[PDB]
Structures are given as structure tokens and as C-alpha cells.
Design an enzyme around this catalytic site. Structure first.
Site, PDB file in Angstrom:
ATOM      1  N   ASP A   1       3.058  -4.369  -0.825  1.00 31.54           N
ATOM      2  CA  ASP A   1       2.599  -4.512   0.559  1.00 31.54           C
ATOM      3  C   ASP A   1       3.287  -3.540   1.510  1.00 31.54           C
ATOM      4  O   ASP A   1       2.665  -3.038   2.448  1.00 31.54           O
ATOM      5  CB  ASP A   1       2.711  -5.953   1.028  1.00 31.54           C
ATOM      6  CG  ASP A   1       4.077  -6.593   1.041  1.00 31.54           C
ATOM      7  OD1 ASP A   1       4.957  -6.157   0.259  1.00 31.54           O
ATOM      8  OD2 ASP A   1       4.282  -7.553   1.824  1.00 31.54           O
TER       9      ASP A   1
ATOM     10  N   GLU B   1       9.166  -3.763   3.577  1.00 31.08           N
ATOM     11  CA  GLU B   1       8.063  -4.295   4.395  1.00 31.08           C
ATOM     12  C   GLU B   1       8.319  -4.063   5.885  1.00 31.08           C
ATOM     13  O   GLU B   1       7.377  -3.851   6.638  1.00 31.08           O
ATOM     14  CB  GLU B   1       7.858  -5.776   4.126  1.00 31.08           C
ATOM     15  CG  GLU B   1       7.230  -6.010   2.768  1.00 31.08           C
ATOM     16  CD  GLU B   1       7.293  -7.420   2.266  1.00 31.08           C
ATOM     17  OE1 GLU B   1       7.683  -8.319   3.031  1.00 31.08           O
ATOM     18  OE2 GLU B   1       6.945  -7.611   1.071  1.00 31.08           O
TER      19      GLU B   1
END
Ligand code: CL
Ligand code: CL
Ligand code: CL
Ligand code: CL
Ligand code: CL
Ligand code: CL
Ligand code: CL
Ligand code: HG
Ligand code: HG
Ligand code: HG
Ligand code: HG
Ligand code: HG
Ligand code: HG
Length: 358
Positions: free
Chosen positions: A115, A58
Site C-alpha cells: 500500500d 505508508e
């Protein structure tokens, strides 16, 4: 190129505020977060002292989004070389790497986190549009490959539910803070694969289910099933995952005028207006009950982002000021201060749709 973009979002406010401040905050983030140590000849985004300067995928996504917006091509390319040096068998980044460049053991470090790769893919589209793909890295080709890997491994092909990893989850457990309708619409338009529109619609459908359980607050859980109910053994509260929802999802309103995004983000913003900008804390049940009481950068900027959809533009201004004012100390300097800078780009008018006239 990049900051200041000088663009106007087609819907909502252009800005709730700056350029000099953003550049100074970028120089600070870059100094603290970017390192060549343990980066395999390239550069990586390190976390902070609290996790001994490891890397999570991330953070690579955040660093690429920031580097392209701040027109840092050499750095972007080195960060992306690190990402590529960590793609797994499915073409998605290993989620957790230690400071010595070893994938971590006992926590499924080989698997990816959706994500992260969604942000990496969006950043590659920005790079293609801002710099062109004829240089050292063919950003557009890399983006198309990554988007295809995301669709193939991270979308349930019948329901269109977004999976949280390439090898686990889906309808029995996924993460609303990963939901990015605006990213998906960009993927659909950029690649021509319209199935991404159904993925976006499914995210809105999940948020609608969550409304049965969030007592009119607009809050979303860290994790939930496709019925909007608790995921076994996973947080159902609005904590450090869920906080990203207001950021990712307000963007669909600014870029595309999505009325579902506005309806939902207005609810969330209205909830935070009860206590005001200074009262934002780091944990609530989705019915609104405070379960933690720290006021930090992981939670303020995303509420400022949600406020862009227009519940109260005066409150939005207060949220902008609070986002600037609250910067976490360095021991815990990775997560909140990254969200702070990302949301500051958005709420100041410096996160335009990469497919728009830049
Ligand atoms: Cl970006
Ligand atoms: Cl960004
Ligand atoms: Cl979903
Ligand atoms: Cl994943
Ligand atoms: Cl979805
Ligand atoms: Cl879901
Ligand atoms: Cl939304
Ligand atoms: Hg950006
Ligand atoms: Hg960007
Ligand atoms: Hg994935
Ligand atoms: Hg979704
Ligand atoms: Hg869910
Ligand atoms: Hg929203």
C-alpha cells in the site's frame, strides 16, 4: 496548482462539504508530522509519540499524496529523496525505519508494504502532471520504475492477486485495505501496461467473495485469503487496516464511474447509517458486531469517503461534518489524523484523477 483544484469528479457528487480549512489542517499536519531529524539530509513523515517518532513507508505515501495536492514541491522532493534512500533490493521502500534512520530489526523492516509504494507511485504521477518532470526529480521516470517494481514483485502473475509484501503473501494472505482499483487503472493508462486492469478486476472479485461472509454489511476484513476466508494468525475483523477500504475504493466510482465500487460502498455506508455518524467505532467483526467502541479519526473519514458513492447524500453531509469535528489528540496523532486529511481532500472535491484535466 493543487488545492483548491476546482475540478468536478465525472461521477457522483463534486463535494459533500473549505479551502481555508484544508490549508490550515495541512499546515498543522506538516508542522507535526514532517521532520528533518533522522531523515538523512532530507525530510520524513514521522509517526507519533506512541511509537517514538519512527517512520513507516505508508506515512511517506500519505505525505507525498498530501504534499503534491497542497502544491509543496520542495517538500515533496525531500520526502521522495528519503523514500529513495530507503528502496530495498526490489526497488520498494523498507517499511519500517526508526527515528535514527536505521531499518528496524525483528519485524522484517527491510521488506516493503504494498500500500505504501502504491501511494508513492500515484503521488509521483500527480507530481509529473502538476509540476512536470524536467526539474531536480524526474517524477515520471521514478513513477514508471516504481510501478514496474510493484507489478514484478507485488502481483501474482497468473491470478493477479495483490501481495501484501514483496517477499511474502498473495493468495494465502493479503489485505483488502491495500486494494486500489482506481490507482491501478491510472497505472494502466499512464504506463500503457494493461495488466493492471486485471489486478483491479481481481480486487473486485475478492470483495465479491467476502460478501459470502459479511452478512450484508459491506465490511471487509483486515486480512484474508483469496477465497475471502480468514488468513492464518491475522485479523479477520474490520479494524485499523480495513478502515482504509472505503477511502481507496470509493475513488474508482468518482474517477471512473465503476458500478462495482458504488454497489460495494453503498453497502458499507448503509451499514454505518444504522448508528449514524456519531456512532462509528474502531472495530467490528465483518458481520457487523462491535468489538471496540472508540470514536476517532481512523474510522470516520473513510466512511465519509464511501458515502460519496450515493447511498444517502444527507448522511454523507453528516459524515463530512463528523470528519471535520473529530480530530485525535497528539499522542496518537499520526494515523487517524492522516486518514482524516486524506479523506477530507477526497470528499471536498480535491483529489481528482491525476490524468484528468487539472
Ligand atoms: Cl497524489
Ligand atoms: Cl490525497
Ligand atoms: Cl487480491
Ligand atoms: Cl511490499
Ligand atoms: Cl489484485
Ligand atoms: Cl485476497
Ligand atoms: Cl469497492
Ligand atoms: Hg492528494
Ligand atoms: Hg494528491
Ligand atoms: Hg510490494
Ligand atoms: Hg486485489
Ligand atoms: Hg483476501
Ligand atoms: Hg467501494
Amino acid at each position: 496548482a493543487g488545492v483548491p483544484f476546482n475540478t468536478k469528479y465525472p461521477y457522483g457528487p463534486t463535494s459533500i462539504a473549505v479551502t481555508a480549512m484544508l490549508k490550515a489542517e495541512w499546515e498543522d499536519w506538516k508542522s507535526k508530522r514532517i521532520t528533518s531529524n533522522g531523515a538523512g539530509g532530507y525530510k520524513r513523515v514521522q509517526r507519533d509519540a506512541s511509537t517514538n517518532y519512527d517512520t513507516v513507508s505508508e506515512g511517506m505515501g500519505y505525505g507525498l499524496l498530501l504534499a503534491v495536492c497542497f502544491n509543496e514541491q520542495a517538500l515533496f522532493d525531500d520526502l521522495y529523496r528519503y523514500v529513495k534512500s530507503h528502496f530495498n533490493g526490489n526497488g520498494l521502500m523498507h517499511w519500517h525505519i526508526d527515528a535514527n534512520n536505521n531499518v528496524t530489526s525483528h519485524d522484517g523492516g527491510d521488506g516493503a508494504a504494498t500500500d505504501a509504494d502504491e501511494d508513492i507511485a500515484l503521488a509521483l504521477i500527480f507530481a509529473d502532471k502538476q509540476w512536470g518532470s524536467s526539474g531536480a526529480i524526474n517524477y515520471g521516470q521514478e513513477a514508471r520504475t516504481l510501478i514496474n517494481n510493484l507489478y514484478n514483485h507485488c502481483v501474482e502473475h497468473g491470478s493477479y492477486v495483490l501481495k501484501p509484501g514483496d517477499r511474502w503473501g498473495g493468495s494465502s494472505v493479503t489485505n483488502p485495505s491495500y486494494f486500489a482499483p482506481a490507482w491501478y487503472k491510472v497505472y494502466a493508462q499512464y504506463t500503457g501496461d494493461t495488466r493492471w486492469n486485471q489486478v483491479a478486476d481481481k480486487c473486485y472479485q475478492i470483495v465479491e467473495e467476502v460478501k459470502k461472509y459479511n452478512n450484508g454489511t459491506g465490511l471487509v476484513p483486515d486480512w484474508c485469503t483469496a477465497s475471502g476466508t480468514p488468513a492464518s494468525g491475522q485479523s479477520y475483523d474490520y479494524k485499523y487496516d480495513a478502515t482504509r477500504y472505503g477511502w481507496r475504493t470509493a475513488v474508482d466510482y468518482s474517477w471512473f464511474g465503476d458500478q462495482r465500487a458504488k454497489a460495494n460502498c453503498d453497502m458499507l455506508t448503509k451499514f454505518f447509517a444504522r448508528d449514524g455518524a456519531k456512532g462509528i467505532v474502531d472495530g467490528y467483526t465483518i458481520q457487523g458486531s462491535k468489538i471496540s467502541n472508540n470514536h476517532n479519526a481512523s474510522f470516520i473519514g473513510p466512511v465519509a469517503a464511501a458515502s460519496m458513492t450515493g447511498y444517502d447524500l444527507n448522511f454523507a453531509k453528516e459524515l463530512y461534518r463528523e470528519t471535520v469535528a473529530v480530530k485525535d489528540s497528539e499522542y496518537y496523532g499520526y494515523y487517524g489524523n492522516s486518514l482524516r486529511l486524506l479523506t477530507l481532500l477526497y470528499i471536498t472535491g480535491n483529489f481528482p484523477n491525476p490524468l484528468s484535466d487539472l
